[PDB]
Design a protein around this ligand. Sequence first.
Ligand SMILES: *[C@@H]1O[C@H](CO)[C@@H](O)[C@H](O)[C@H]1NC(C)=O
Ligand SMILES: *[C@@H]1O[C@H](CO)[C@@H](O)[C@H](O)[C@H]1NC(C)=O
Ligand SMILES: [Zn+2]
Ligand SMILES: [Zn+2]
Ligand SMILES: [Zn+2]
Ligand SMILES: [Zn+2]
Lengths: 61, 61, 532, 532
Amino acid sequence: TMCYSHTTTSRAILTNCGENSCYRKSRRHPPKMVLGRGCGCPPGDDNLEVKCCTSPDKCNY
Amino acid sequence: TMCYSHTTTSRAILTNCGENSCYRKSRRHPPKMVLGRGCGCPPGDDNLEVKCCTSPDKCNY
Amino acid sequence: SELLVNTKSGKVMGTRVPVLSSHISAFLGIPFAEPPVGNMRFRRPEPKKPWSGVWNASTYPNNCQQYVDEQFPGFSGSEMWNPNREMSEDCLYLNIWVPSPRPKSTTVMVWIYGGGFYSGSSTLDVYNGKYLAYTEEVVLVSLSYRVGAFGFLALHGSQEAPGNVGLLDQRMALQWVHDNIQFFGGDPKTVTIFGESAGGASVGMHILSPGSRDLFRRAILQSGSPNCPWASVSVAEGRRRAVELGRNLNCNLNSDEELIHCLREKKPQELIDVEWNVLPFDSIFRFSFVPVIDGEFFPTSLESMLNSGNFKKTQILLGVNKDEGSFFLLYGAPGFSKDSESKISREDFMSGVKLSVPHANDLGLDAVTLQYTDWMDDNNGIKNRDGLDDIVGDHNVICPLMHFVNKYTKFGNGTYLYFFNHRASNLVWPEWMGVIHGYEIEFVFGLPLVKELNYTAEEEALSRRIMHYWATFAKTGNPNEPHSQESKWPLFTTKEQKFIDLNTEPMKVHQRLRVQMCVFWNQFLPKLLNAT
Amino acid sequence: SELLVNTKSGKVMGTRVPVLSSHISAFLGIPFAEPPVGNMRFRRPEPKKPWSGVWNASTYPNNCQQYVDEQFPGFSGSEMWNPNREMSEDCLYLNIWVPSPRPKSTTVMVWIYGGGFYSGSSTLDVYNGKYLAYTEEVVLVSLSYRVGAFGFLALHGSQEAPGNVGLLDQRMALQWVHDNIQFFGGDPKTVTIFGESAGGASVGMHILSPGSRDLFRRAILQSGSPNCPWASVSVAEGRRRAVELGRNLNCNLNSDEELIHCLREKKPQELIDVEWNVLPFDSIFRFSFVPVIDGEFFPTSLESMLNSGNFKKTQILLGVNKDEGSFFLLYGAPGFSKDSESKISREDFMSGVKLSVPHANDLGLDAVTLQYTDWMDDNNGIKNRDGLDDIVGDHNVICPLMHFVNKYTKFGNGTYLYFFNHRASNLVWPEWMGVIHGYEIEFVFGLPLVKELNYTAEEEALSRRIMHYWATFAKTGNPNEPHSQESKWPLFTTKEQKFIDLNTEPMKVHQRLRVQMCVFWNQFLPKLLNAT
Ligand SMILES: *[C@@H]1O[C@H](CO)[C@@H](O)[C@H](O)[C@H]1NC(C)=O
Ligand SMILES: *[C@@H]1O[C@H](CO)[C@@H](O)[C@H](O)[C@H]1NC(C)=O
Ligand SMILES: [Zn+2]
Ligand SMILES: [Zn+2]
Ligand SMILES: [Zn+2]
Ligand SMILES: [Zn+2]
């Protein structure tokens, strides 16, 4: 699964996640901002809103 | 001088005032309402606004 | 004969009034109460003691003691509203137009006149019911009731000057129509009251009062409402005004008995002269003596009654006119005049704005100003005139009516709303005044059907359509004829809020009558004033 | 040679950059401050110690440590604003484009970039000054300054983290342009600063601060203002945010020294991750670390400075865009999306309305709702989208700018106002976003003159007209050329309040830019909130 990958100080690249999930961690409350992407699916809290998707490609936009 | 004449319970008629003045007594503050007309020019207060005119005719409209 | 009808209080005799081509029966001047003269002044009405012989109900009754507006001496636009008969304390009468031949049991429409509660006369030419009664073939009654101090001086507590006396006069008229209207060919069960300005507020005050709910089946409120800002006052405010009327005549104010007895010794002429002193503020569309929320005639506060539902639950057909505030601006509002296009300057708009809403605070007046101002042209005399015209109509008529509609519709048995926006082609008022307050009555009463009045062909059709809606609503309880015609006047609902315009053009169904402005008046401003 | 210029801090060497047909001299990367690394993080800047030999000013400098917005990964509408160079704590540099051949003494324009004070890069392609400097033949400088915590962490009292450090960076850049710009062919006396969004707020914050008033002659504020709701915070609020940034990294908060030392030990990567936690509320167009009204850099409260007059009194050329709030709605406001026509439901409008103005109370939010709602169509997705678009632009940019204009014009030495309302023909943002925040910069910087960019013939003319107004204003102090051309851009006055639109159509002079809405925002709402 082709997915985006980056941090708060990185530009989004499209690395290949295996059969693994792709996340899209953000700031739950407005301004709901993306604070990271990549392969995996970390835990969060009220403040963070991780959004894991295994399909299709570029699914963590 | 032909002028209007009436009270708060009378319809306006056009009687002839001599060489005398015609008034138009009203309620100074809104609703500025006519409370009387005729020949003369009585005194008033903050509440009453007498308006005397000697010309032309029907001048106290 | 037909001109002879025996009523519960005695025998009555009327006359054949010519209606267009035909003629109709009319009983002008039937007493429904003992002349409220003597000590009876200010007191609750008394039933008219039964007479011996045939009463002569052929000539129009006396009008009630009131103020004559000679603002525009000899102007037919103003003088036509002044009492045309003789004024007198013995004015509690009623008139009846019965379709010839007398019907067995037909719909009854009872008219309640307006006049800010300080004026009124069932005998006006715009209140002539031979056309409506004859056209729709319904019995038409138009009542009388004391106005001003005579019918509304209200010292809560005292028994000789309680308060809602003017409304008690109307209720006595309705109770007579309830008992006796069958002997004239009218159905006491299908009786519907209808009135304009203060009469509509009365119709609304009869729909709220317990003792008046079982004297009528349906109702109609034209340009008026029980909750209008000018229609009522507390039992304290009215008391303040009673005492004020007293000190204005040099009366003993020590107690009610001493005050009331004094005012009774005064000629009726004397009360009317000092009546406007009763106005505590300095404004527009605010009167002297009006009904008081007694806790007797009006159980609780009108709003409480509206919320809980405490009110007669029938169907109503109500509405307003495009320009309700116009006429009211001609009595002091800076820049206005009947003889000009009354273009208002910014500073005169601000002045008038302070007059239209005498209850708001500075921030509320800023709220009003910002709402009714074109900041991209705050100096346009036309926009300032109109936004000031709109402030009086909305605040004083249109919104209080839309507030009553929504509350009532929650417990109503059907509701219809209109918006009369046609300007009479033969109107003598200045173009800028638009569709004026009270200028629908002549369409309701069928005047435009009289060739001698100089209306247009399309105007006769509008009056016929309005007369019909009014009558059909009175009988059916729905303006719309079943399986007949095509035009469908939408039943007003709190959801879609449909209503229709009343003009000489196709039946146009609109929705939400002045909602942005009435949200400001009804919901927002009240919130602002209380949070401040 | 020409590419060789000796400055007060050392010798510099630039390169010949190709500008359209000709070429121009450019000194990319001149240090104006000691790299704020080590213990120097959070502290006030230091002058760049003079170097030995020729500095190589041919390649673009480093960008400052900041957040990269990958909201729309690979979207050229967003990615073009992200730092294009390498981010680094050693980013305090400046760039200079000198018309070839070098001028003797020409006008200097200094650009201050925007980015809500948390982002920014003088090295963007929309900030490329070879076109403007070459076209109007003026020396063009574009500075650098620390953003976010690095340039704005503010613990009032402490000397290692005082506060307005990011602005102190700009002032150091201006002082270098003051001392050294003559050696490049620029007139230190005719220097005018100009910037967008936060840069414009900075231009405004330089016009208010005493220590920055004698480093520039004139000024320009594009879509920004010192008094913008998002531009500043108290010395307490900023302190709250500093401590919050600390506990978010598990720092010792016992004292400033212990807090500040801790944050300095952290990788710059670490500060940016927990930076948005600094946002206390839950809203739109509100940032983390912004200037604090120190009582040092900013004597008193901005408003006080505006009222009394306490501010540099020169001429300014300021303005706004039609749709300033659009982009800001794409970060959480329910119903919005770059990929749809973002039609908003009533309930989502109410939600967003609560987000746009995070400072108002319920009655204030009712005030906002009633103002920006079409009650005759409170469910129209287009009107709700637009009224929500307007709430962000007016509250956050348009009105705060109109408030600054009126205050300044009372002591200003001439003022010009614009309203850029042309939508780029080659815009990659969704049609519903209109004329977006920051989308005028490409007209100011002459991009549309480059055939390879795909603009229209009429668009090159607009950029040329805007470049010209900007340059002529910088020299003359008046956008309008004397005895030349016909189009006359009216000088803004507090009386008639004239301004002009900036589009590819005839010079249209309007008056009162968003007055009804800005009376609500500027005058009324503030009154309401305080009375409650
Ligand atoms: C009363 O009825 C009689 C009978 O026709 C009529 O002549 C008279 O006009 C009516 N009333 C008065 C006051 O004349
Ligand atoms: C510094 O100047 C030289 C001289 O031409 C140039 O080749 C070089 O690209 C510049 N800087 C860097 C980092 O290469
Ligand atoms: Zn009795
Ligand atoms: Zn004046
Ligand atoms: Zn030093
Ligand atoms: Zn929903």
